[PDB]
Design a protein around this ligand. Structure first.
Ligand SMILES: O=c1c2c(n3ccnc3n1Cc1ccc(C(F)(F)F)cc1)CCN(Cc1cccc(Cl)c1)C2
Ligand SMILES: O=c1c2c(n3ccnc3n1Cc1ccc(C(F)(F)F)cc1)CCN(Cc1cccc(Cl)c1)C2
Ligand SMILES: O=c1c2c(n3ccnc3n1Cc1ccc(C(F)(F)F)cc1)CCN(Cc1cccc(Cl)c1)C2
Ligand SMILES: O=c1c2c(n3ccnc3n1Cc1ccc(C(F)(F)F)cc1)CCN(Cc1cccc(Cl)c1)C2
Ligand SMILES: O=c1c2c(n3ccnc3n1Cc1ccc(C(F)(F)F)cc1)CCN(Cc1cccc(Cl)c1)C2
Ligand SMILES: O=c1c2c(n3ccnc3n1Cc1ccc(C(F)(F)F)cc1)CCN(Cc1cccc(Cl)c1)C2
Ligand SMILES: O=c1c2c(n3ccnc3n1Cc1ccc(C(F)(F)F)cc1)CCN(Cc1cccc(Cl)c1)C2
Ligand SMILES: O=c1c2c(n3ccnc3n1Cc1ccc(C(F)(F)F)cc1)CCN(Cc1cccc(Cl)c1)C2
Ligand SMILES: O=c1c2c(n3ccnc3n1Cc1ccc(C(F)(F)F)cc1)CCN(Cc1cccc(Cl)c1)C2
Lengths: 175, 174, 175, 173, 174, 174, 174, 174, 174, 175
């Protein structure tokens, strides 16, 4: 509700190839984001797609569904963190095309996983998910598994500069 | 809410894309069934694509979709993104042979969770589970014994081991 | 994301002479179903009207309202059971035109009544209603009154092929 | 709850354990404790068990059943009001010749459509088959007739229950 | 709280007064049955008095009390004050002949309101109603036809109309 | 609810007027951010007007709007009507210098109330609090020490006094 | 549930009739303000009519409307129907002098109820009452003392008492 | 609602019969521990009997009871009636060797349900399962592998399967 | 509920055993404080035993117990069974040196979860966090830097590893 | 519940002339505390009474009711702050007999009033209450009104040392 019409603002964002992942991640967000990503690739397999992330995280399998769609599609993907990017949110941020992951000056980044689950699962599977994130995180930051898991073991946010040095993003820009 | 293009969920249907992601209930089954029959009227032979990201749901609602997939003449490509558990993996395994896919980081589970339209007797719950035994055995080409033994474990499968088991055919990445 | 549009899908099903009854049978479902049947008869008193049934049952008087409407209209009525047809659902399925009652391979049929009432009723009327089902069931299955009453007391589901042998449906189709 | 020269504590002084309600784990524990206490008082004096239950958790009912067979005491079961599902199983498990009903009591063996924990289909069936053998044992009915009867969602009269083997005597006073 | 006398509800039991004031449920049934069995153990022949001010309740719980009244050897005086509807009037009518009482302004109803422990079938609810037909006919000395015909009307009866019907015998003022 | 004029909230947007009335959360932030980014596409440097009547809200959502205001090239005139507390006053103070306004009877508060998207540790709440210090110090031209002292007090300030503090520049009447 | 004409509330605003019926909160305030600013853009000189049937509301939101009325150049006729209490009567008294009206049975109360957007200190609520004191004193042209004593009485006023006090100018029936 | 004898649950504890019926939580654990420590103070050598009818519960609370059994010097006879699942079967298997019993129809399950006192990380839940693995392996005398494969199956065991697996020693009926 | 022995929780107190099982709040703090102050009155220097199986709780309530332990003259043996997290581990580490124990399968965590009596500012939460640093550093004999690093990690430690960290001194089995 | 018996611990505290004001202040706490204070004076008008405070504050009129009882009774009153003493709690702490107000090392003290009310009242009365506290606070700390109101205007806790220097208490003791 209370969405203005322009000549619809969220639909007008999509004509600029901008997908929003604001808010928590659940299955409905994942399907909606995925549909827009596949739609944007069908318009052009070569024009860049932009993703604005202001998310506290969400369901792990729903987040991996988006991540896999980003890897699948051919388009370069520029990720933009505004507000914060925590848990799966920071993973999507880190999953952008190298050199095209940006953050605003006062944005917050967190890779620690929250202490999320569609259905009840056992620790053998919940741990498989955590390692699944380890390898994904290690891939895109170019850090060893020892470095990724140790950082994520600590509950703390990073400044946009700090997430750049750890390897989550490439550019902390102001204007 | 849902953005408008050139509505995006109607636009997915415009490409012969049916989504069965999210939990399966009787109304979800009816809606999916309506879309499959509508797509068959467009072309009895052009392929239908079905995206699965479901943790399962009502068994009779899942079988309603399954029987509808088997009924229509169209080839059906199943695509597992996110995860497919319980009835979700059955629909995934029920795709056209050679046309069942998953993305690299997907979770697949055939184990049934401990879902029910009405309270039923124990003989019917066993009659229903036996129905799933035969369906899984049909499309995975595994014996009944290995299927019943497999679902006994409350564990998920990776897309590559699910392929060797016969639930899907290709783990693609682009 | 509740309803897709076709090039409305539930209105398009109605353009195809297909009435679908999935949710549980209540007064609001009955009125809406009845309206479509009278609408489809006004379009053509002779083209077959189709009924897709996937219901766990519902209000008995609301089911009889649909049942009575089926008998009244002149059209041949093809009933199609997908998923399941229990209590009033199976009564509607069995009330189709003879030779036109179908089920899909893995569907469930149950005539046992669950242990259904708009308002509070006395025991005497509940028995009058149960007897009402006996005659409707006995009529359309061509089974004895006794075999119907003993069958319904058993709390079991039956497969489409034993349901065909019982007389509730005629064709278990395979495509 | 009235005091007498406590009324439920006084019933236990008369070797009467009352169920009279759904079979919880808490009901089962309390009933089981009373049976073990009454046996320790006397392994040979009969214990009376009053049943007015619509059933309950199956594992909790089997817990009581296992305790009844364990103790050496003759057990007189008395069904007043009604005895459905697990309730009728306890009724039929009394000592032979000592299972009674009041004239207007209700007996039901049909199982309701054991939810301590959510369970699988294979285990749920293993559980009813476990109930079949107990009923088959104590009614002296074949396994086939027991399973067919339980599939019918009907109540029995105290005479229908006496002839079926669930009880032995329908008395008025 | 309950006042203390030198406890008032326990003092009523010392006077062979059982209270059935309030709706009938299984927990009420256990207490009434327990007190009746206790009072019989004190004396097989001294009369027990039963105070009824109930709007009815669970049918199986009411019949459980009814069966206990018939079982014990004691004469039972039923006293209806306030009102006695559904099972309340059945217990009232089930007193010893010549000892069923009402106060001038009590309400009596045999009509059943529109058995309630668990969901049951149509044949069982009808079997339960037929049991009520025979019991009422036994203690009112009316034919079955007049019992059911009367019960179809939910009118309440005056303690006088109920006496002529056979539900009670002595409606007193002092 | 909302009137149509030859829609009133969309018509405010046609006049380059963004409204931040009400509490700030992530959904408010997304909408404000979208309108700010949209308004830049019509004109690189035409001024944008921002109406604030907010009691505050989520800090990360407030910083998200703040960063967007600083990012875009347009000069931004902020207008406080009613009140601007917590993050509300930060957005008000973050307008283009010389263009931060209040109406005569508005209340302004920079003290933060005792809020976050998720539960966080003590070190992060302090980092955010320090982040607010630096932003406030930057735009008020006050030292860090005086800013910290101002926020320590649970008091509101009048528009004409917020001007002397540096939160706004002009308190207008007509 | 709103009837449509050549929308009835949009047709009212189409004639410069702003409605403040119902309680004041921030969502009401934003809408009233937008309508006042919109009506000024069509004509800074055509009179605006404002209908008040409000029991009061949030004080900061009421002051926002008050500030918007004072800011715009239009003459504003306020019309009280039903009642105007707390902030409602403040908006009523804030109309253009000589253009404040009431209907015969409308009720006026200046007493403030015993709220605000957020929990605040005792000094801030007191700053607000003195702030309201001056507003009332300005437009009723009574001394500050007369306002404080009047608002202190938990009573409603008749439209004749309201004009004599200085809150309004005309009570018309036709 | 607990009957009194010369309290029935206090009379059970008076004979060294500790009951673990019902789900395990911290409040149950404290009480069981206190009873075990109390029974040891009367005699470090008289056997303690422990009745288990539990569907499981909090793992840390279950381990606290397990640690208390191992600490005290008394031989402990565990008795399974009804069922012993999750932590319940762990306490059952943790009895003194040769003194672990079950009744004929009691059910045993080692599969862990898909909780804990507080929300925790994936590594900590995994530390707990390996920790339970060693406990089960110790007292059933099966390899760690055999425990992990067994607990992986979402199935209950019969008392005969339970003794053969090493969880208990005797299934008695009399 | 609670057994009587010739009351079990009062009998633990007769043995100078205070139990801190369950979460800590002000009502828990008052009761523990009262028992600690009471136990000092029987004996100035007889050791007091403290059983901890707590996931933490209110920080000011936890410090209230901590200050009482430090205040009283008695040596205090702390015993961790089950788990001791957040304030729970602080009380465990606050025992008399050489007398802080854990049972083999206990879990210990000093990281604080992301709690307070009333809503507070960022400066106070940090002062309390720093207060916890100094207490932890004092009793573990670790530097402030290593303590802050330990608490930053959302992990539990085993009893034998908490010993090397200095939280406890002896992990006992019998 | 779960209160141990000693040979009752809260009743045994009262035989040691120790009143507990732990938890929030409401009318029921005030009456209960007041009754114990009057009882302790009736036992001895000259033996000291001890008050343990671990309170986040509460209803202002209920707190003033306790304060007035402390001033009325003749006994010396030793106040002890453990945990924290906020809003009205710190007022009761400050109201002890001079030289007999103590705190434990890690206790928290706050005079700022929370942002509490039996019934809805106007600002003229709510402000009268605040000034009523100003004069009470100024009395027992011996600070000017300007100093009291300015300190209380700032939202912050004090360390037990800091509350001593401001004048709330006299002794920060450890053993
Ligand atoms: O300003 C951009 C930016 C991008 N971008 C990509 C393609 N076009 C653009 N434009 C132009 C444009 C946007 C929206 C619309 C319309 F839809 F609202 F009309 C019309 C034109 C990329 C990233 N971003 C950076 C950014 C700044 C502030 C907050 C956030 Cl979260 C991120 C700016
Ligand atoms: O990209 C596809 C894919 C399919 N497919 C089938 C027909 N057309 C397509 N296109 C083009 C297209 C899609 C959507 C729209 C519109 F509706 F959004 F506009 C318009 C054109 C099938 C398989 N799939 C694979 C896939 C990769 C990543 C995640 C997921 Cl869940 C699945 C891609
Ligand atoms: O496919 C059919 C079937 C019937 N039928 C009757 C008339 N037309 C049809 N069509 C073609 C068609 C359907 C819908 C549309 C549109 F409206 F959606 F566009 C357009 C064309 C009846 C038999 N069976 C029914 C059925 C029910 C439930 C589960 C399954 Cl597996 C099978 C299929
Ligand atoms: O069929 C009728 C009936 C009446 N009637 C009156 C005028 N025209 C009609 N038609 C034709 C028609 C119906 C609906 C539509 C349209 F809504 F779909 F457009 C268009 C034409 C009343 C008499 N009878 C009543 C009736 C029988 C069975 C069950 C129910 Cl419940 C009620 C039916
Ligand atoms: O019968 C026992 C059994 C044990 N046992 C141990 C010590 N004494 C006994 N007695 C005698 C006794 C019990 C209770 C009391 C009193 F306190 F209630 F009065 C007095 C004497 C061990 C367990 N075993 C097996 C068992 C059977 C049925 C259900 C359960 Cl769950 C377990 C029975
Ligand atoms: O009447 C009995 C009956 C038994 N029995 C066994 C031992 N003593 C008895 N007495 C005497 C007595 C009862 C109660 C107390 C006191 F404790 F409540 F005061 C004291 C003495 C067995 C069961 N039988 C059958 C029965 C008939 C009616 C309804 C129910 Cl439900 C069951 C009755
Ligand atoms: O009056 C303005 C003011 C601004 N401004 C900026 C651009 N245009 C304007 N106008 C004209 C206009 C408004 C609304 C519409 C329409 F959309 F409703 F039609 C069309 C034209 C800025 C600041 N503001 C100050 C202000 C005073 C009172 C209350 C509030 Cl909340 C704020 C006035
Ligand atoms: O066994 C102890 C232990 C202590 N201790 C201290 C003083 N006395 C004892 N006893 C004897 C005793 C206990 C209870 C009672 C009574 F109250 F229940 F009767 C009477 C005597 C200290 C530590 N603890 C260690 C411990 C092991 C297992 C689980 C837990 Cl939670 C803790 C053992
Ligand atoms: O230890 C005291 C202390 C006082 N005091 C006053 C009179 N007697 C005492 N004793 C002896 C005693 C207390 C309780 C009982 C009994 F009731 F529990 F049995 C029996 C004897 C005053 C203040 N206080 C300081 C204090 C330390 C720890 C926490 C807190 Cl909140 C405050 C200690």
């Amino acid at each position: 509700s209370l969405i203005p019409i322009v000549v619809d603002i969220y639909s007008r964002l999509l004509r600029e190839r901008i997908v929003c992942v604001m808010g928590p991640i659940d299955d409905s967000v994942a399907s909606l984001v995925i549909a827009q990503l596949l739609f944007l690739q069908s318009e052009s397999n070569k024009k860049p797609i932009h993703m604005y992330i202001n998310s506290p995280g969400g369901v792990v399998t729903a987040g991996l569904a988006i991540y896999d769609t980003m890897q699948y599609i051919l388009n370069p993907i520029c990720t933009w963190c505004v507000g914060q990017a925590a848990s799966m949110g920071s993973l999507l941020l880190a999953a952008g095309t190298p050199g095209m992951r940006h953050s605003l000056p006062n944005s917050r980044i967190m890779i620690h996983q929250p202490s999320a689950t569609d259905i009840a699962i056992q620790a053998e599977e919940i741990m498989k998910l955590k390692k699944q994130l380890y390898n994904i995180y290690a891939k895109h930051t170019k850090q060893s598994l020892q470095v990724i898991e140790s950082a994520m073991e600590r509950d703390r946010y990073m400044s946009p500069m700090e997430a750049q040095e750890f390897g989550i993003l490439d550019k902390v820009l102001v204007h």
